[PDB]
Amino acid sequence: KILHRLLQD
Amino acid sequence: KILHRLLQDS
Amino acid sequence: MAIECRVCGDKASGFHYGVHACEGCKGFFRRTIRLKLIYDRCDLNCRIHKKSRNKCQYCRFQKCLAVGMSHNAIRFGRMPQAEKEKLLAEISSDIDQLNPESADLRALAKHLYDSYIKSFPLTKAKARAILTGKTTDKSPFVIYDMNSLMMGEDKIKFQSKEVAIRIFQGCQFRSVEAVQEITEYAKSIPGFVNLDLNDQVTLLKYGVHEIIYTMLASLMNKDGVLISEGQGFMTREFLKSLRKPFGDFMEPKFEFAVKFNALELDDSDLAIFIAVIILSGDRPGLLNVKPIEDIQDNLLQALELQLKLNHPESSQLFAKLLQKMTDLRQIVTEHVQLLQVIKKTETDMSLHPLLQEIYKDLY
Amino acid sequence: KHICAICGDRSSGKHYGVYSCEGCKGFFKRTVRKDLTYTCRDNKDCLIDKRQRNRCQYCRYQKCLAMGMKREAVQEERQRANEDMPVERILEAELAVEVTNICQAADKQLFTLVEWAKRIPHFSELPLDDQVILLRAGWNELLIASFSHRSIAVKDGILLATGLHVHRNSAHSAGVGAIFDRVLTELVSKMRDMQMDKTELGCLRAIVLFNPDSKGLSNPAEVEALREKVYASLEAYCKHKYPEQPGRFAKLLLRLPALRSIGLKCLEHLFFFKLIGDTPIDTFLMEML
DNA sequence: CAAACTAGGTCAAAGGTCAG
DNA sequence: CTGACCTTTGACCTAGTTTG
Ligand SMILES: CC1=C(/C=C/C(C)=C\C=C\C(C)=C\C(=O)O)C(C)(C)CCC1
Ligand SMILES: O=C(Nc1ccccc1)c1cc([N+](=O)[O-])ccc1Cl
Ligand SMILES: [Zn+2]
Ligand SMILES: [Zn+2]
Ligand SMILES: [Zn+2]
Ligand SMILES: [Zn+2]
Numbered sequence: 001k002i003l004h005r006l007l008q009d
Numbered sequence: 010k011i012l013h014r015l016l017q018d019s
Numbered sequence: 020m021a022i023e024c025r026v027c028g029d030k031a032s033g034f035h036y037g038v039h040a041c042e043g044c045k046g047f048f049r050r051t052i053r054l055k056l057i058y059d060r061c062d063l064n065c066r067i068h069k070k071s072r073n074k075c076q077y078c079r080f081q082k083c084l085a086v087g088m089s090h091n092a093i094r095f096g097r098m099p100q101a102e103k104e105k106l107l108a109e110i111s112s113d114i115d116q117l118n119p120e121s122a123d124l125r126a127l128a129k130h131l132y133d134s135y136i137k138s139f140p141l142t143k144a145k146a147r148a149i150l151t152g153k154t155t156d157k158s159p160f161v162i163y164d165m166n167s168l169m170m171g172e173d174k175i176k177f178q179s180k181e182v183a184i185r186i187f188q189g190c191q192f193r194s195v196e197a198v199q200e201i202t203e204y205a206k207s208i209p210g211f212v213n214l215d216l217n218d219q220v221t222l223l224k225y226g227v228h229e230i231i232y233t234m235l236a237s238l239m240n241k242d243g244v245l246i247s248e249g250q251g252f253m254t255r256e257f258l259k260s261l262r263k264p265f266g267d268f269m270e271p272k273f274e275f276a277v278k279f280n281a282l283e284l285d286d287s288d289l290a291i292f293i294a295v296i297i298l299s300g301d302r303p304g305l306l307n308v309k310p311i312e313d314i315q316d317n318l319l320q321a322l323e324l325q326l327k328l329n330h331p332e333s334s335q336l337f338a339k340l341l342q343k344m345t346d347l348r349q350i351v352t353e354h355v356q357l358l359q360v361i362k363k364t365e366t367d368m369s370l371h372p373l374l375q376e377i378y379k380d381l382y
Numbered sequence: 383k384h385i386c387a388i389c390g391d392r393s394s395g396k397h398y399g400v401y402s403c404e405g406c407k408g409f410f411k412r413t414v415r416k417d418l419t420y421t422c423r424d425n426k427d428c429l430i431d432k433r434q435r436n437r438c439q440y441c442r443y444q445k446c447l448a449m450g451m452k453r454e455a456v457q458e459e460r461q462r463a464n465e466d467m468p469v470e471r472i473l474e475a476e477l478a479v480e481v482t483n484i485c486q487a488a489d490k491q492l493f494t495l496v497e498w499a500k501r502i503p504h505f506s507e508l509p510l511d512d513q514v515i516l517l518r519a520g521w522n523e524l525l526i527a528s529f530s531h532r533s534i535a536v537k538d539g540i541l542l543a544t545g546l547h548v549h550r551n552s553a554h555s556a557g558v559g560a561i562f563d564r565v566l567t568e569l570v571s572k573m574r575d576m577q578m579d580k581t582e583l584g585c586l587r588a589i590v591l592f593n594p595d596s597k598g599l600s601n602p603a604e605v606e607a608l609r610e611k612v613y614a615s616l617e618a619y620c621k622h623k624y625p626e627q628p629g630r631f632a633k634l635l636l637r638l639p640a641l642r643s644i645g646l647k648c649l650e651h652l653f654f655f656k657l658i659g660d661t662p663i664d665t666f667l668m669e670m671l
Numbered sequence: 672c673a674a675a676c677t678a679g680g681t682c683a684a685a686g687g688t689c690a691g
Numbered sequence: 692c693t694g695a696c697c698t699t700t701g702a703c704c705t706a707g708t709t710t711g
Contacts, residue, residue: 001669002665002666002669003496003514003517003518003666003669003670004510004514006493006496007496007506007510007513007514008510010220010376011372011373011376012202012220012223012224012373012376012377013216013220015199015202015203016202016205016206016212016216016219016220016223017216032677032701032702033676033677034676034677035677035678036677036678041701042701042702042703043700043701043702044701045677045678045701046679046699046700046701046702047699047700047701049678049679050699050700053679063462065462070457070458073457073460073686073699073700074460074461074462075462076699090678093677093678094676094677094709095676095677095678095707095708095709096675096676096677096708096709096710097674097675097676097708097709097710097711098675098676098710099709099710099711147454150452150453150454151452151454151455152398152399152452152454152455158399158450158452159450161447161448161449161450163444163447163448167448240453240454241453242447242453243447252450254444254447254448256444256447278595299636299639301568301572301636301637301639301640303564303567303568316629316633319629319632320628320629323632334610334614335610335613335614335617337632338610338613338617338631338635339610339613341632341635341636342589342635342638344636344638344639345638345639345641345642346595347639348639348640348642348643349642349643349646351643352643352646352647353646356650382643382647395683395684396683396684397684397685398684398685403694404693404694404695404696405693405694405695406694407685407694408692408693408694409692409693409694411685411686412692412693436692436693455684455685456685457685457686459686459687460686460687460699
């Protein structure tokens with residue numbers, strides 16, 4: 001969720 | 010301190 | 020007096036077709052000609068050592084031909100003037116390699132090796148003969164379940180507590196012996212006995228563990244592990260099968276072993292690496308650090324040169340093998356958090372009094 | 383000639399140290415080469431006959447091991463500048479990004495770790511799943527390796543990445559002095575007494591980052607590579623900026639074991655601290671735990 | 672000739688294929 | 692994926708070569 005967010009962009 | 014043993018034995 | 024082959028680097032069986040070749044190439048060649056075999060082409064300059072040899076029939080029947088190997092120069096008879104080359108490979112080229120400072124690094128490497136051989140019985144050498152079946156010994160009695168264990172547990176015996184508890188409680192004496200060997204090996208490391216005897220003990224308290232798994236890997240493979248002097252072979256699968264907390268006890272070591280064995284380190288290489296672990300100035304409880312670290316400095320110096328010489332082609336191995344020192348620390352701390360679990364949920368632990376000493380206040 | 387001690391079929395030779403039928407011989411051989419991991423759907427109690435041996439692979443292979451079939455016996459299938467990891471991007475990366483009090487700095491530094499990681503060559507270049515995994519597997523070790531370097535010039539205490547000198551004492555009493563001591567002496571000191579520049583510490587953090595073992599890496603071969611790259615790179619670096627000290631590259635890589643020993647102990651703690659609920663732990667720290 | 676070696680044959684055992 | 696079927700290897704053994 002989070003870590004995947006800072007990475008998704 | 011049982012290693013001191015093996016270390017101190019020819 | 021014990022040269023090697025010129026095509027693959029294996030031990031040479033003799034002077035075949037005007038050139039020192041292994042009993043393997045000698046036959047390959049005598050068979051290429053003998054049957055006129057015309058191996059398909061291939062450009063890639065293929066390195067040719069012991070195992071890659073049978074990788075490309077064209078590059079092998081090439082290299083040999085490219086260093087003598089003629090159905091002509093086959094010089095029969097008795098060796099007339101060995102002398103000329105009875106000074107081994109590095110003869111006059113030796114007063115270049117058997118020097119300068121490294122001449123001594125070479126010495127140290129040997130010492131620790133020759134010492135390693137007298138300290139521990141079952142060397143990597145042996146264990147591999149066994150696990151490869153290339154030995155005039157009987158195949159170790161494989162132990163994959165209760166029937167095989169119940170059976171071999173008698174065949175070679177020296178208290179009915181429990182299978183899971185017998186398996187591991189019963190090896191405690193090897194750990195001990197192991198610890199005893201390491202220790203005598205420690206003294207053989209230039210300058211170990213001299214170091215404050217207090218740190219001497221510390222360096223071991225924390226050393227043996229990591230040194231144990233390093234050794235314990237030579238006997239291992241993906242499918243199991245050698246035991247009982249190497250006359251037995253317990254399976255990875257069976258162990259994985261033990262009860263509640265005892266099944267995932269030896270797992271961490273197999274994973275580690277499968278990786279550590281990829282480096283393909285031999286006894287010569289492992290004899291030094293080991294010495295480096297005992298002499299780690301980063302052990303808690305040390306105060307005479309500098310000394311301890313000085314030796315590691317020189318041992319490492321020796322180690323590195325040994326990997327270059329021994330394993331000519333293996334990228335960053337020195338750096339790769341050091342990385343293993345980090346996996347070892349994890350294995351131990353992990354192994355301890357476990358033996359802690361046991362202490363709290365079991366009631367038979369009863370560790371030997373020496374394993375007792377070492378494990379106390381470890382991590 | 384004989385009877386395969388695995389299924390009963392006709393042997394016709396000894397294979398891999400055991401009298402075995404051609405079928406079994408080939409089963410074993412492939413299992414070993416293609417590195418296959420079979421699984422029993424039943425009770426690992428499957429019989430193996432000349433017929434129905436192909437029934438379950440797991441039981442069959444294990445039957446091989448039991449009957450003493452040697453794996454190492456299987457030979458190996460007969461077939462077939464230096465700045466790919468520039469020391470600058472690293473250094474530049476280790477730059478641009480700089481008990482209940484420690485978990486605030488921890489969490490804070492977590493968001494910024496994704497930044498550092500992004501800047502480290504080829505990292506964001508490999509699958510997002512691995513980017514997660516790699517950061518999941520080593521956030522604590524990374525984070526510790528950095529504040530520990532920061533607390534280098536600082537005395538008997540660390541400097542949280544928010545400005546909170548956590549002098550020893552404060553800890554030995556705070557309950558967590560057992561580890562706070564090791565962090566100082568096995569990391570801080572060692573680094574200080576070695577004057578570890580922050581280009582080196584960056585390469586070490588990178589080495590920790592590119593961890594090929596980290597469970598689940600789509601293509602771990604990839605990761606074990608970028609790591610070897612940093613190996614090559616940093617080695618040379620120590621060679622250029624530090625000619626007097628040959629054994630530097632080694633002494634640097636050897637700062638890593640402790641980093642993991644310690645690292646593991648910390649995580650051990652943050653747990654009997656987590657699903658307890660006695661002290662605050664922010665969100666990013668929850669996804670990581 | 673005895674002693675010191677080797678090309679060459681030998682066959683268990685390990686490698687490779689590719690219908691089924 | 693299996694496994695009947697077929698090619699290679701290379702560890703030994705042996706009969707013939709050459710040096711002292
Ligand atoms: C080290 C350490 C701990 C754990 C924290 C972790 C995993 C990371 C901290 C990162 C910081 C403080 C980063 C920064 O801001 O630079 C605990 C709480 C068990 C107690 C004291 C020692
Ligand atoms: O049980 C073992 N080791 C062990 C147990 C408790 C604490 C430390 C090591 C073991 C050791 C060895 N060894 O040392 O060669 C071999 C096999 C086992 Cl199962
Ligand atoms: Zn050869
Ligand atoms: Zn080729
Ligand atoms: Zn069979
Ligand atoms: Zn099954």
